[PDB]
Amino acid sequence: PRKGPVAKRDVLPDPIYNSKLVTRLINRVMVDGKRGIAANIIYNSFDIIKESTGNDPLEVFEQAMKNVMPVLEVKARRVGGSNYQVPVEVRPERRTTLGLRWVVNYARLRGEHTMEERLAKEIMDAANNTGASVKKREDTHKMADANRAFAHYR
């Protein structure tokens, strides 16, 4: 906050797949503290992945979270009386966090009444680098370095 840095709230991996990234995928989707429904839909979504064109679903998760996950970012700052912006770095933690954030953003309104083939085909097509979320990352890289001009001298 003001004194300095802080702790990190360490997490524990899955009962089955043993992955903190999928654990973070669980604790992002969980609404109102109901972990049973989120666990059911995530394991059944991996089952749908394993049926049609999927062998190691942790690894197709890792491909999807390669190609949605950024490398740079903007930040709307101010220095002396006007609102500016700057191409900024990103920690590897916030990099995965923003990747999961954008995925679960577009995992909301695909149009399917299945609560998990939106998720399954989301990380499939993100591993296929299609859908809007990989293009969201590409637009983030696009809006980065166009603002390199009025932010390299600050």
């Binding site: 006007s82 001009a149 009025f150 001298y153």
Partner: protein, 117 residues
């Protein structure tokens, strides 16, 4: 027309406006733009962002008449006069020399009443 292919542009930036005009090698006026000319008002002409978009809107008409390289005249000590140059670099010019000439007198005249605000 005619592929002029070179020339000198002009930058003039007050504390409440900034204005760009692009000439020939002497030069006659080709096309110009201002922060107010792009539909802005009053206070907001002091931003470096409006300088960017006005300079680029000048370059768009400037290179529709045959133009690759340009030199930069800068009058008007202000704020956005660097963003004008750097967005002038952005949309396809080849700025090769910059002369910032804002002339100092040698104490010939007087400034006005030194304000009380």
């Amino acid at each position: 027309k005619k592929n002029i292919e070179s020339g000198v542009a002009h930058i003039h930036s007050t504390f409440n406006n900034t204005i760009v005009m692009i000439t020939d090698t002497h030069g006659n006026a080709l096309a110009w733009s201002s922060a107010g000319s792009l539909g802005f008002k009053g206070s907001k002409k002091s931003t470096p962002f409006a300088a960017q978009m006005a300079a680029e809107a000048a370059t768009k008409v400037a290179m529709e008449h045959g133009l690759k390289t340009v030199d930069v005249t800068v009058k008007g000590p202000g704020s956005g006069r660097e963003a004008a140059i750097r967005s002038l670099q952005a949309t396809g010019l080849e700025v090769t020399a910059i002369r910032d000439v804002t002339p100092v007198p040698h104490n010939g005249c007087r400034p006005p009443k030194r304000r009380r605000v």
